[PDB]
């Protein structure tokens, strides 16, 4: 067979998840450019372009990014839940954590599934937030770390000269420290963000604790159905 229809349509009656411009990192983190991929139903496979346009709006790196995309090949459903509701941060301030690197109708904005916490009254009290997974299916969480440009900003946004981020679950212990350096300016912002991820098994808890440079998760990802799928690279469009 040397001939093909030239279109890109569904397999076995279930429509694939066609990522137009944003990619796995952009969609999972909730890039403000593509808000049409929230609450996405079941799919057959994931289609993304070879060179995504809106990928990791704010500069930085996705830790174990290729590890996560391997898991997405075997997952056929994702659901959003309120793991840590907003407006519950009465001490730290969550709304003002917005950057000019992410435009949205001309406003500076941020990712949907993560929240950037900054100081409110020149104080950054330590937070001890823990979530216990009562859901039967496996649960996915993801957070991030903010690396400031210089020490002047560190005191400007978090008020703590030395900060740490500790994440602890049953099979993961982790101390994270901000790595201040002088970097180049990509997307207009010198600071960088290193996002992390982990898989939370049912009846297991993940404990967060930090006093600065923390990016608390906002929505968590359920894993409803596990099947077979592939993340193909193509510029084709839906063909019905």
């Amino acid at each position, epitope marked *: 067979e040397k001939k093909h229809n030239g279109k890109l349509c569904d397999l076995d*009656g279930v429509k694939p998840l066609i990522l137009r411009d944003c990619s796995v990192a952009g969609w999972l983190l909730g890039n403000p450019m593509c808000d049409e991929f929230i609450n996405v139903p079941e799919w057959s496979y994931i289609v993304e372009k070879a060179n995504p346009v809106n990928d990791l709006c704010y500069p930085g790196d996705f830790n174990d990014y290729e590890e996560l995309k391997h898991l997405l090949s075997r997952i056929n459903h994702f659901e*959003k839940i309120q793991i840590i509701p907003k407006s519950s941060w009465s001490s730290h301030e969550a709304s003002l954590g917005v950057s000019s690197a992410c435009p949205y109708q001309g406003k500076s904005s941020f990712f949907r599934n993560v929240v950037w916490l900054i100081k409110k009254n020149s104080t950054y009290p330590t937070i001890k937030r823990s979530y216990n997974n009562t859901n039967q299916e496996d649960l996915l969480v993801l957070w991030g770390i903010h690396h400031p440009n210089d020490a002047a900003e560190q005191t400007k946004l978090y008020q703590n000269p030395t900060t740490y981020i500790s994440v602890g679950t049953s099979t993961l212990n982790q101390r994270l420290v901000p790595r201040i350096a002088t970097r180049s300016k990509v997307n207009g912002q010198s600071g960088r963000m290193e996002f992390f991820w982990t898989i939370l098994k049912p009846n297991d808890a993940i404990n967060f604790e930090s006093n600065g440079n923390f990016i608390a998760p906002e929505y968590a990802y359920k894993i409803v159905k596990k099947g077979d799928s592939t993340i193909m690279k193509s510029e084709l469009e839906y*063909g019905n």
Partner: antibody
Framework: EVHLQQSGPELVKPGASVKMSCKTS????????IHWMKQSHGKSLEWIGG????????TYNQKFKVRATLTVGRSSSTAYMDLRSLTSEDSAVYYC?????????????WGAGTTVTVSS | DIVLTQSPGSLTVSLGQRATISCRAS??????????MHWYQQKPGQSPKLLIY???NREFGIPARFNGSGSGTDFALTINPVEADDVATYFC?????????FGGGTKLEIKR
């Protein structure tokens, strides 16, 4: 949000022609086909037809193939239907919906619903 | 041309008791390994909204009280529990081949 609007209520003498409208926003108009339906005072639902905005491919039900016409304007991201030989039988409400799949999928979101009536 | 017959025509259950709604098809609506029948709910004075797609999977935003199961020609939808904010008309739709057809509707009455 992928909320879809429609036009307002319509009045016309029987035997004339009408042109309804549907406005799409919050999502890519090319990917998802737009379908239409008719509801006669809530007794039941029939599928009228669907149109693919990507290339203007149109499919119709045999009950309305004679007079139903579907057209999309990509510039304005809107879908319209044309009715011919209106009759008191056609006094009902219509819904502008988008099918998620491809001839096997489901209709995800429904419009507000534009009702029509004919009377002298 | 699948014609959908839905029984009972009018269902009446008070608050808290399981409410089972069912409809049958002429031939099988199962193809490619998955049965293609979708469940719709239309509240009074409102446009219908999707409840269950492909007869098993439930849409996000729909409370987990709605359960749909079925195989072959018969499919059922169960709601546990039932409160006052559940009165509507429910339809089951097939999509095996065009044209698409709907059920006859079912009013869900409440005893009190």
């Amino acid at each position: 949000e992928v909320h879809l609007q429609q036009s307002g209520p319509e009045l016309v003498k029987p035997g004339a022609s009408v042109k309804m409208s549907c406005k799409t926003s919050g999502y890519t108009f090319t990917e998802y086909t737009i379908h239409w339906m008719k509801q006669s005072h809530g007794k039941s639902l029939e599928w009228i037809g669907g149109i693919f905005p990507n290339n203007g491919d149109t499919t119709y039900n045999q009950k309305f193939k004679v007079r139903a016409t579907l057209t999309v304007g990509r510039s304005s991201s809107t879908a319209y239907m044309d009715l011919r030989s209106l009759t008191s039988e056609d006094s009902a409400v219509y819904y502008c919906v988008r099918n998620y799949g491809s001839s096997y999928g489901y209709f995800d979101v429904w419009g507000a619903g534009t009702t029509v009536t004919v009377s002298s | 041309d699948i014609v959908l017959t839905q029984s009972p025509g009018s269902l009446t259950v008070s608050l808290g008791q399981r409410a089972t709604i069912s409809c049958r098809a002429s031939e099988s609506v199962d193809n490619f390994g998955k049965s293609f029948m979708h469940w719709y709910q239309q509240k009074p004075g409102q446009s219908p909204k999707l409840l269950i797609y492909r007869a098993s999977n439930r849409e996000f935003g729909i409370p987990a009280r709605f359960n749909g199961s079925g195989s072959g020609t018969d499919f059922a939808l169960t709601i546990n529990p039932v409160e006052a904010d559940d009165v509507a008309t429910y339809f089951c739709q097939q999509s095996n081949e065009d044209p698409r057809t709907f059920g006859g509707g079912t009013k869900l009455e409440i005893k009190r």
